[PDB]
Design a protein around this nucleic acid. Structure first.
Ligand SMILES: [Mg+2]
Ligand SMILES: [Mg+2]
Ligand SMILES: [Mg+2]
Ligand SMILES: [Mg+2]
Ligand SMILES: [Mg+2]
Ligand SMILES: [Mg+2]
Ligand SMILES: [Mg+2]
Ligand SMILES: [Mg+2]
Ligand SMILES: [Mg+2]
Ligand SMILES: [Mg+2]
Ligand SMILES: [Mg+2]
Ligand SMILES: [Mg+2]
Ligand SMILES: [Mg+2]
Ligand SMILES: [Mg+2]
Ligand SMILES: [Mg+2]
Ligand SMILES: [Mg+2]
Ligand SMILES: [Mg+2]
Ligand SMILES: [Mg+2]
Ligand SMILES: [Mg+2]
Ligand SMILES: [Mg+2]
Ligand SMILES: [Mg+2]
Ligand SMILES: [Mg+2]
Ligand SMILES: [Mg+2]
Ligand SMILES: [Mg+2]
Ligand SMILES: [Mg+2]
Ligand SMILES: [Mg+2]
Ligand SMILES: [Mg+2]
Ligand SMILES: [Mg+2]
Ligand SMILES: [Mg+2]
Ligand SMILES: [Mg+2]
Ligand SMILES: [Mg+2]
Ligand SMILES: [Mg+2]
Ligand SMILES: [Mg+2]
Ligand SMILES: [Mg+2]
Ligand SMILES: [Mg+2]
Ligand SMILES: [Mg+2]
Ligand SMILES: [Mg+2]
Ligand SMILES: [Mg+2]
Ligand SMILES: [Mg+2]
Ligand SMILES: [Mg+2]
Ligand SMILES: [Mg+2]
Ligand SMILES: [Mg+2]
Ligand SMILES: [Mg+2]
Ligand SMILES: [Mg+2]
Ligand SMILES: [Mg+2]
Ligand SMILES: [Mg+2]
Ligand SMILES: [Mg+2]
Ligand SMILES: [Mg+2]
Ligand SMILES: [Mg+2]
Ligand SMILES: [Mg+2]
Ligand SMILES: [Mg+2]
Ligand SMILES: [Mg+2]
Ligand SMILES: [Mg+2]
Ligand SMILES: [Mg+2]
Ligand SMILES: [Mg+2]
Ligand SMILES: [Mg+2]
Ligand SMILES: [Mg+2]
Ligand SMILES: [Mg+2]
Ligand SMILES: [Mg+2]
Ligand SMILES: [Mg+2]
Ligand SMILES: [Mg+2]
Ligand SMILES: [Mg+2]
Ligand SMILES: [Mg+2]
Ligand SMILES: [Mg+2]
Ligand SMILES: [Mg+2]
Ligand SMILES: [Mg+2]
Ligand SMILES: [Mg+2]
Ligand SMILES: [Mg+2]
Ligand SMILES: [Mg+2]
Ligand SMILES: [Mg+2]
Ligand SMILES: [Mg+2]
Ligand SMILES: [Mg+2]
Ligand SMILES: [Mg+2]
Ligand SMILES: [Mg+2]
Ligand SMILES: [Mg+2]
Ligand SMILES: [Mg+2]
Ligand SMILES: [Mg+2]
Ligand SMILES: [Mg+2]
Ligand SMILES: [Mg+2]
Ligand SMILES: [Mg+2]
Ligand SMILES: [Mg+2]
Ligand SMILES: [Mg+2]
Ligand SMILES: [Mg+2]
Ligand SMILES: [Mg+2]
Ligand SMILES: [Mg+2]
Ligand SMILES: [Mg+2]
Lengths: 135, 70, 386
RNA sequence: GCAGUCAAGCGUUCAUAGCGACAUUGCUUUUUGAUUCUUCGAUGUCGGCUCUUCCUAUCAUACCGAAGCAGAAUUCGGUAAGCGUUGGAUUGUUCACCCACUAAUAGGGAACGUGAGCUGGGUUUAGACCGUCGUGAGACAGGUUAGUUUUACCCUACUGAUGAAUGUUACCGCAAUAGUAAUUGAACUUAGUACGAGAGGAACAGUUCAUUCGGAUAAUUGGUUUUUGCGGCUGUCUGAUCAGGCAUUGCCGCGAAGCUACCAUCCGCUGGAUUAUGGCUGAACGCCUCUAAGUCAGAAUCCAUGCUAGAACGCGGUGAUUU
RNA sequence: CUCUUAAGGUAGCCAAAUGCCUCGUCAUCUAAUUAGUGACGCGCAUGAAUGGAUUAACGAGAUUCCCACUGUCCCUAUCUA
RNA sequence: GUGAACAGCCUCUAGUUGAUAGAAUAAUGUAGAUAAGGGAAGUCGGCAAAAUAGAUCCGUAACUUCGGGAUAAGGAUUGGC
């Protein structure tokens, strides 16, 4: 039911459909290929776009045969589009990365390779627990 | 409010200014503008760029009591 | 036959026509509701849009993720040297609407305002209001005859004020003259106050204060003739398409046999009047204050003028208003600031701000410094200098 | 294709909560047929793109009335078209069908809207292959592949732009009329409450954000570079140096200013009257009844406030008017 | 077994640029595939120089996917003549 | 001259300097360009555009009529002194 505790201030959208981002958890998915964004409305021809902390629906293009060929929810931990927070700073990661997780928002895996943006870790306390450096 | 500093050139960075970049390793790289940033992105060495605080510090450019009563 | 997919219409039909606005002055279409129990003050002010800068402040929005956190915000800066009152105009309501039944002008008129009644000032004999000034030679019973007339009649009294253009960096010399409505009580008290202020000066802080919400009324920065696509936001047409891609493919259906007021078509863009509302007043300037840019947190004596000076504008030597966000129109253009049309609770308004820091870095590029006193400190000493 | 009437039945019981047989009255002209009025000295044919407007037989969002409405959820209905109705996979396709998001992924019209707007993938000439048919030429409503998309300078229409005449010129104003705008979701809390045996599980007040839409604006961040602003490079030319020419802007790093991006920021108002509906008082009719007289409350409605034009044959106040 | 023929489709190939039914079924690739490919074959109407089957290499030939790449697109923006 | 080179680019000789012009620098265009994050979601279809590239070295599959395939694939280098 999109557990997702807190609001989220808007940050620039870097992840349209078709965009394939790296898999930052120990699940054994190598990449997540985003087919939709949770909580995007509609406009003629606009490609639904996710950003840090957004939950998406993905398939796994490279990975364990258990995880391939099936739709499943994700959470974007890592952006690469510069976005702007309310303290003024324009910041961006090196890669696009997310962690496969369940609709509740509970991670598939126990750990996250890499850092995570503070917005996403505040959003999803199960991503909080498994997170390394934050921002 | 903190003034931050450009880790490449060394120039002061006032709030809501410049860019910020989180490399894979979580080393945080703050630029005052596009110029420093774009250098960073070419693998340019600050000590080798004449106007960087790094360079002029390297070249030593322009640096120019009490009583014991116990 | 029908749309085949539904989308909003491009553009807001309410702002039609898209034509070039009537003058660089934007008209004040309304004034705050008169509460006559209050003392008589101006309802609006005249000024010039100088430029923008950045702010830093703590945020009071309990329950927000930034509550008690610092934020940067863009602001804009209006040169606001006191207005001078040159006259009052009275209005009576009729079944046909409100109607002005006289004006009264003070004796001596400034050579800035005088310059406004003239297309060529250097050639004129400068005769304006010379015979009108003769109305003061006696006790001024001709004057008083109107003044008391406006008292007798006139549900509504406005003041004619003008800018002090000379007192600003502009090159324009010919001041801007405008009607301001008087919202203190008792139409008599109003024209009393009017008279006593003839030829006098009135500055901005008699009108607005800090945290107050004010509306901006100005003419849009104009772009001249525009194509369909940027003017209305029409989607670009495909690459492969003959004879133009920035267009509307279907100007309309066969019937009706005429293209419609509602279809996007290429014409003027920009230079419209706009009435823009709800800006919080972040700072109330005094040109007689050194340490304008300063703050209880900052403390280092600097004015709001950036190094290198507001680009295309100048130095802000007088009082000023600083308002959150951006205001319609562009730099050097004459701008009206109006008190709000309504009482807004809204909690976002009513937030009482305290600026921490006002960005003094130069705007002619990516500025590295606030004061000249800092630039020396960091950089040290040069091949000029000592 | 859509809606009624009767009410045998269905619905544990109970015709009509929700339905409904036998029959019967209808509407509609996004079906197809029927016809042949118009056009064969020519009305560019399918679909899609794009864009605008209209319908309502409302999918969503407002307010309501009904339930086989405890709660949740759903379903029937009224006022309702103000407002939104998407992103993809195969397919030329309309259609069909799946995937996914969504408040919802309603149906239709405008010469089956829209080709001097596009495209040309299909259809529908002239090349060619196959299969069936034919002795044959050739045929095939059987499958394929290649196949030139013309013109606007006229009138009107629309978009913006000037303008004679009413003494002149100038400044400040009014506002008939015409336009109008906002949208929708979520989290916190109410509250693990009401309700329920439980499983489950709301709403108003409040707070924080978000969607679509719109008007701006350039502090900041990004884009753009003929500032050919500075620096670098190759080739060749000026004996060399210094400093430069030529390479359709020679190329590359940075690059102000300007323009400009939900890729950046800011902003988007408040009164009134009604609709359905629920009531008061209240006869007709000594009772009863929201209705007949009269009357209270009320929706994304409507009229305004606000917002944009400002009649070039609507107008008011005011300055100065030539030897 | 029977009726019938000049002989009654062999070897091969197949929903093939040959299959009406038809978007055939199964498999595969996909989140999803009237597409592709692999199979199956009472094949409307496959088939032996009316040439059948297969095929290295070739091809501005029709089609399918993948990697790279991209203003094709989200979504537009800016410059030069 | 550079260079593999009658390539492309610059030059000597000779021969031109002909093509209506002036002032601007709206929309739309024709011709040339660049774009943050995404990377074909656009679309009948990657149409179009981008990416690739020269030379030295290293590495080089299925299949094959043993000639090929083959620059397959894929890497490293490169100036001046
Ligand atoms: Mg959607
Ligand atoms: Mg489309
Ligand atoms: Mg920049
Ligand atoms: Mg429709
Ligand atoms: Mg008004
Ligand atoms: Mg074409
Ligand atoms: Mg001070
Ligand atoms: Mg600037
Ligand atoms: Mg018919
Ligand atoms: Mg029909
Ligand atoms: Mg006919
Ligand atoms: Mg005819
Ligand atoms: Mg005909
Ligand atoms: Mg014709
Ligand atoms: Mg015809
Ligand atoms: Mg025609
Ligand atoms: Mg209806
Ligand atoms: Mg129930
Ligand atoms: Mg249910
Ligand atoms: Mg409508
Ligand atoms: Mg029809
Ligand atoms: Mg048609
Ligand atoms: Mg047409
Ligand atoms: Mg055409
Ligand atoms: Mg055709
Ligand atoms: Mg064709
Ligand atoms: Mg012929
Ligand atoms: Mg045929
Ligand atoms: Mg051809
Ligand atoms: Mg073709
Ligand atoms: Mg012309
Ligand atoms: Mg006349
Ligand atoms: Mg119970
Ligand atoms: Mg209980
Ligand atoms: Mg509430
Ligand atoms: Mg917008
Ligand atoms: Mg805009
Ligand atoms: Mg350049
Ligand atoms: Mg050289
Ligand atoms: Mg040279
Ligand atoms: Mg020389
Ligand atoms: Mg030298
Ligand atoms: Mg030369
Ligand atoms: Mg050059
Ligand atoms: Mg810039
Ligand atoms: Mg924003
Ligand atoms: Mg109001
Ligand atoms: Mg009544
Ligand atoms: Mg408004
Ligand atoms: Mg009229
Ligand atoms: Mg008029
Ligand atoms: Mg008349
Ligand atoms: Mg007049
Ligand atoms: Mg097939
Ligand atoms: Mg075959
Ligand atoms: Mg096959
Ligand atoms: Mg099947
Ligand atoms: Mg298939
Ligand atoms: Mg495909
Ligand atoms: Mg077959
Ligand atoms: Mg059959
Ligand atoms: Mg046969
Ligand atoms: Mg045969
Ligand atoms: Mg034979
Ligand atoms: Mg045959
Ligand atoms: Mg053979
Ligand atoms: Mg053969
Ligand atoms: Mg050939
Ligand atoms: Mg060929
Ligand atoms: Mg094929
Ligand atoms: Mg050589
Ligand atoms: Mg040569
Ligand atoms: Mg020429
Ligand atoms: Mg323009
Ligand atoms: Mg360019
Ligand atoms: Mg790009
Ligand atoms: Mg990129
Ligand atoms: Mg990629
Ligand atoms: Mg594609
Ligand atoms: Mg596609
Ligand atoms: Mg598509
Ligand atoms: Mg498609
Ligand atoms: Mg091409
Ligand atoms: Mg070989
Ligand atoms: Mg190679
Ligand atoms: Mg070397």
């Amino acid at each position: 039911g999109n557990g997702a505790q807190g609001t989220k201030f808007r940050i620039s959208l870097g992840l349209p459909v078709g965009a394939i981002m790296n898999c930052a958890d120990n699940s054994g998915a190598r990449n997540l290929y985003i087919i939709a964004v949770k909580g995007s409305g509609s406009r003629l021809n606009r490609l639904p776009a996710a950003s840090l902390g957004d939950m998406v629906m993905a398939t796994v293009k490279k990975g364990k045969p258990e995880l391939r060929k099936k739709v499943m929810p994700a959470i974007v931990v890592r952006q690469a589009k510069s976005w702007r927070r309310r303290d003024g700073v324009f910041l961006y990661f090196e890669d696009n990365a997310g962690v496969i997780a369940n609709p509740k928002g509970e991670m598939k895996g126990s750990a996250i390779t890499g850092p995570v943006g503070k917005e996403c870790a505040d959003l999803w306390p199960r991503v909080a627990s498994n997170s390394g450096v934050v921002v | 409010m903190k003034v931050e500093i450009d880790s490449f050139s060394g120039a002061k960075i006032y709030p809501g200014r410049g860019t910020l970049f989180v490399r894979g390793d979580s080393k945080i790289f703050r630029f005052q503008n596009s110029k420093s940033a774009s250098l960073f992105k070419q693998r340019k060495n600050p000590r080798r760029i004449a106007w960087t605080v790094l360079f002029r510090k390297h070249h030593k450019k322009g640096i120019t009591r009490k009583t014991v009563k116990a | 036959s029908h749309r085949k997919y539904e989308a909003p219409r491009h553009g807001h039909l309410g702002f039609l026509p898209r034509k070039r606005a009537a003058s660089i002055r934007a008209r004040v279409k309304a004034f705050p509701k008169d509460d006559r129990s209050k003392p008589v003050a101006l309802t609006s002010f005249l000024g010039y849009k100088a430029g923008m800068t950045t702010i830093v402040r703590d945020l009071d929005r309990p329950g927000s993720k930034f509550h008690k956190r610092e934020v940067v915000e863009a602001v804009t800066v209006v040169d606001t040297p006191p207005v001078v009152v040159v006259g009052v105009v009275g209005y009576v309501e009729t079944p046909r609407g409100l109607r002005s039944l006289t004006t009264v002008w003070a004796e001596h008129l400034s050579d800035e305002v005088k310059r406004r009644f003239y297309k060529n000032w250097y050639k004129s004999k400068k005769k304006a209001f010379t015979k009108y000034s003769a109305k003061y030679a006696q006790d001024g019973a001709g004057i008083e005859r109107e003044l008391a007339r406006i008292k007798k009649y006139a549900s509504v009294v406005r003041v004619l004020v003008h800018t002090q253009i000379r007192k600003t960096p502009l090159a324009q010399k010919k001041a801007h003259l405008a009607e301001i409505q008087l919202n203190g009580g008792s139409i008599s008290e109003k024209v009393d106050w009017a008279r006593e202020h003839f030829e006098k000066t009135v500055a901005v802080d008699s009108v607005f204060e800090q945290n107050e919400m004010i509306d901006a009324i100005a003419v849009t920065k104009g772009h001249g003739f525009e194509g369909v696509t940027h003017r209305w936001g029409t989607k670009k047409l495909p690459r492969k398409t003959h004879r133009g891609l920035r267009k509307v493919a279907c100007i309309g259906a066969w019937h009706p046999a005429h293209v419609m007021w509602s279809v996007a078509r290429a014409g003027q863009r920009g230079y419209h009047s706009r009435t823009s509302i709800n800006h919080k007043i972040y700072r109330v300037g005094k040109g007689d204050d050194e340490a304008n840019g300063a703050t209880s947190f900052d403390r280092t004596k600097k004015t709001i003028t950036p190094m290198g000076g507001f680009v295309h504008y100048g130095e802000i030597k007088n009082d000023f208003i600083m308002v959150k966000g951006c205001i319609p129109g562009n730099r050097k253009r004459i701008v009206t600031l109006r008190k709000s049309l309504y009482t807004n609770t809204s909690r976002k308004a009513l937030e009482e701000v305290s600026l921490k820091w006002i960005d003094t870095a130069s705007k002619f590029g990516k500025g590295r410094f606030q004061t000249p006193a800092e630039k020396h400190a960091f950089m040290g000493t040069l091949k000029k200098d000592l």
